[PDB]
Amino acid sequence: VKVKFKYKGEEKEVDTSKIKKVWRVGKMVSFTYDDNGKTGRGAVSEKDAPKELLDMLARAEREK
DNA sequence: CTACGTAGG
DNA sequence: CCTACGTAG
């Protein structure tokens, strides 16, 4: 149910509902996410990015 | 080793 | 300022 990525040498999983912001960098989907009020950072490839997330990205792009 | 987007302490 | 991320150049 969550986004799986690697950040600074480790695998992580975050529930989409935790995403704050998302944007595109080449083929990479980059983002920030809530970690208790603290702001995490994560990135994953679009091939490994899950629909919902891709959906958030689209809207964000559409908007702006 | 550079580029690309964006924010973090 | 500048790294971190995935992928290409």
Swiss-Prot record:
Highest rank taxon of the organism: Archaea
Record family assignment: Belongs to the 7 kDa DNA-binding/endoribonuclease P2 family.
Pfam families reported in the protein's UniProt record: 7kD_DNA_binding (PF02294)
Gene3D superfamilies referenced in this protein's UniProt entry, alphabetically: 2.40.50.40
Task performed by this protein: Can constrain negative DNA supercoils. May be involved in maintaining the integrity of the genome at high temperature.
Record keywords, A-Z: Cytoplasm, DNA-binding, Methylation
Note from the entry: Sac7a and Sac7b are truncated versions of the Sac7d protein, most likely resulting from post-translational processing, or degradation during isolation.
Biological classification of the source: Archaea, Thermoproteota, Thermoprotei, Sulfolobales, Sulfolobaceae
Record protein name field: DNA-binding protein 7d
Summary of temperature dependence: Hyperthermostable.
InterPro entries named in the record: Chromo-like_dom_sf (IPR016197), DNA-bd_7a-e_arc (IPR003212)
Major location (coarse): cytoplasm
Modification comment: Lys-4 was 70% monomethylated in form 7a, 25% in form 7b, and 20% in form 7d. Lys-6 was 50% monomethylated in form 7a, 40% in form 7b, and 50% in form 7d.
Modified residues (N6-methyllysine): K4, K6
Localization terms from the record: Cytoplasm
UniProt pH dependence: Highly stable from pH 0 to pH 12.
Subunit structure: Monomer.
Annotated Gene Ontology cellular component terms: cytoplasm
